[PDB]
Prior knowledge:
Helices cover 27% and strands 31% of the residues. By secondary structure, the protein is of the alpha/beta class. It has one domain: Ribonuclease Z/Hydroxyacylglutathione hydrolase-like (Metallo-beta-lactamase, Chain A, 4-Layer Sandwich), CATH 3.60.15. It has a seven-stranded mixed beta sheet. A five-stranded mixed beta sheet has the order 8-9-10-11-12, with no helix packed on it. The termini are far apart. GO terms for molecular function: beta-lactamase activity; zinc ion binding.
Amino acid sequence: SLPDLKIEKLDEGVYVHTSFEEVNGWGVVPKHGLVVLVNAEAYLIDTPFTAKDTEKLVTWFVERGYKIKGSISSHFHSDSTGGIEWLNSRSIPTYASELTNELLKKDGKVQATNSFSGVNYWLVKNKIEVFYPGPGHTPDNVVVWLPERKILFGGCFIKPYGLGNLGDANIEAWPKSAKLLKSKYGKAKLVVPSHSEVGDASLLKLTLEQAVKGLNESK
Ligand SMILES: [Zn+2]
Ligand SMILES: [Zn+2]
């Protein structure tokens, strides 16, 4: 049996949710996302793997008095988008980049109800920012920045000890994207990866080194 959904406070108004799925050739895979509170409204940063855990996550915050105002998915893989169909069924606004939605549509999967195009986007002005560093883990991966807390959710782009699943990866572009990401968020207090533990800004450097190492290996 897979471990249960975990919800843990990371900072004021910021929670980490961890869900688990068995993924072929990878084993049981932990997935971190965030829940961000702005007054009495909650925003999901990535959904858990499944509708089940997405519902558990939503009920947990609603039963504590937070309205779910929306979700954003950092890329098209199911560990970021698995709960979009369920959220859509509950009339909770779902967001993804235009390219993420395109890839979902291409894969015959449910798409977010809202989309954004361009390098920067405010999900919530001055509270929750989305940034596209360029292709890496996937062509569409984006990160989410919380300027009030100096917290960066790096998603599956942040890979400080190894690059993970390269099936949809762009190894040529990843070092360039990681360099850009590092320049932009060097002052992050915390960096939250999808598949390894929260760290500080050094995770940006480590990701860059792993990206460079990964590209070098392929030649
Ligand atoms: Zn992924
Ligand atoms: Zn992932």
